[PDB]
């Protein structure tokens, strides 16, 4: 229709092929190594936590928990965004001050807070695991000492670029198949476009494109729509990334705080005066039916066989 046509300008389907990372060429050995590192809990000092713990490829690329602290740029606990299609995000942080956010993008996003704080421990751990240096040599040829914090992030990044979810019903719709989604789905899309949601949640990743001066907070003055609202005040130090809504139906809970569990309530909360939006409960329901067509084909990811410790591998730090 013209609804389809408008949708085809606002969004693009996820390509099936992993996107190319500038200055980070993919090769099977580098993808394979990134997969190992992504699932390797020895990257944490406890030896218990891997990327997959908080960005679980079985659970929509997130952890279905409210918040955690995973990374050095967080000022507090935040909900773990999906790693699925994360390589298509422009804005990669939940929130910050405008003057910081571009510099923060100097990355890497693929380092947890422990790795970023103690990159010497990361390298020493990997060098002490006999099967790693050979993989690093194969994945990063022509370097004398390829086992580096920067190459760890590069290998993860190329593996991460394979964690894309093409072929959601909405994407079949964008490709021109009007029947790929129900007519109620389509009405939800019409509301999404007309009410102005698409402006913030747009492009190939349907979001992750920018930061906005609205964040969902507790209302200071009985139900999630009554308890939380979109807030924007004079005193705001930080702006908020408007997230990609792809796979939103399988990555509850919602918002930077993880505090809203139901996708319907999230949608009602986004029907906010602060945003120029008023939606009825029946509107909210149609928008949800639409948001449920953004679930892509989930990657089937082999759990890696990790190289064993040596006697030299540092011990877990305890309890």
Helix H or strand E encompassing 215: strand 215-218
Residue 78 known to bind ligand = yes
Q: What is the DSSP letter of 290?
A: H
221's tokens:
């003055």
Establish if 244 lies at the interface with Ca ion (CB under 5 A): no
Q: Residue 133 Cβ, how far from a second copy at the closest point, in Å?
A: 26
Q: Which of 32, 66, 114, 160 is catalytic?
A: 114
Output the smallest distance, CB 154 to a second copy, in A. 11
Evaluate whether 62 touches 243 at the Cβ level (below 8 Å): no
User: Which residues, numbered 108-127, are part of the site for a second copy (CB under 8 A)?
Assistant: 109
- What Rg, from alpha-carbon coordinates, does the chain have? 21
**Max Cα-Cα span within the chain:** 65
Would you say 129 or 311 has its CB closer to ligand HEC? 129
User: Quick check: 131 binds a second copy (CB under 8 A)?
Assistant: no
Burial 75-93 (b: 16+ CB within 10 A, else e): eeebbbbbbbbbbbbebbb
- Measured from the CB atom, the residue of 160 and 285 that comes closer to a second copy is 160
- From Ca ion, a second copy, ligand HEC, none, interface partner of 99 (C-beta below 5 to 8 A by class): a second copy
Contacts of 224 (CB under 8 A, 6+ apart): 260, 261, 262, 265, 268, 269
Residue 186, token pair as written in the block: 């389509």
Question: Is residue 179 packed enough to be buried (19+ CB in 10 Å), middle (13-18) or exposed (0-12)?
Answer: exposed
Burial label for 262, CB within 10 Å (0-12, 13-18, 19+), is: middle
Would you tell me which residues interact with ligand HEC (CB under 6 A)?
38, 43, 49, 51, 53-55, 68, 70-71, 74, 78, 80-81, 83, 86, 89, 92-94, 109-110, 112, 115, 156, 192, 195-197, 199-201, 212, 214-216, 240, 242-243, 245, 248, 251, 254-256, 266-267, 270-271, 275, 277, 279, 287
Q: 197: annotated binding-site residue?
A: yes
Residue whose tokens read 């930061």: 211
- Find out whether 94 is annotated in a ligand binding site: yes
**Active-site residue, 114 included:** yes
Annotated binding site for Ca(2+): 79, 251, 253
Catalytic positions: 114
Annotated binding site for heme c: 51, 54-55, 71, 73, 78, 89, 93-94, 97, 104, 112, 197, 200-201, 216, 241, 255-256, 270
């Amino acid at each position: 229709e013209d609804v389809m046509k408008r949708a085809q300008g606002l969004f693009k389907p996820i390509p099936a092929k992993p996107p190319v990372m500038k200055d980070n060429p993919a090769s099977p050995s580098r993808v394979e190594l990134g997969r190992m590192l992504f699932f390797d809990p020895r990257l944490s000092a406890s030896h218990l936590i891997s990327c997959n713990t908080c960005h679980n490829v079985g659970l929509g690329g997130t952890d279905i928990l409210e918040t955690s602290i995973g990374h050095g740029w967080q000022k507090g606990p935040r909900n773990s965004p999906t790693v699925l299609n994360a390589v298509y995000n422009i804005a990669q942080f939940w929130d910050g001050r405008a003057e910081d956010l571009a510099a923060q993008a100097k990355g890497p996003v693929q380092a947890s807070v422990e790795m970023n704080n103690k990159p010497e421990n990361l390298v020493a751990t990997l060098k002490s695991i006999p099967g790693y240096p050979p993989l690093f040599r194969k994945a990063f040829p022509g370097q004398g000492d390829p086992v580096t914090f920067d190459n760890v992030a590069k290998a993860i990044e190329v593996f991460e670029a394979t964690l894309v979810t093409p072929d959601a019903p909405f994407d079949k719709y964008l490709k021109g198949n009007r029947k790929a989604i129900s007519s109620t789905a389509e009405q939800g899309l019409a509301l999404f476009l007309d009410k102005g949601c698409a402006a913030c949640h747009s492009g190939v990743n349907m979001g992750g494109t920018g930061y906005f001066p609205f964040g969902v907070r507790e209302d200071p003055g009985v139900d999630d729509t009554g308890r939380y609202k979109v807030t924007s005040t004079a005193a705001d130090k930080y702006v908020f990334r408007s997230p990609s809504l792809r796979n939103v139906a399988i990555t509850m809970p919602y918002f930077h705080s993880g505090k809203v569990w139901k996708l319907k309530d999230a949608v009602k909360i986004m029907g906010s005066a602060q945003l120029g939006i008023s939606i009825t409960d029946a509107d909210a329901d149609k928008i949800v039916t639409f948001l449920n067509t953004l679930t892509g084909a989930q990657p089937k990811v082999m759990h890696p066989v990790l190289p064993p410790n040596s006697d030299d591998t540092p011990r877990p730090v305890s309890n």
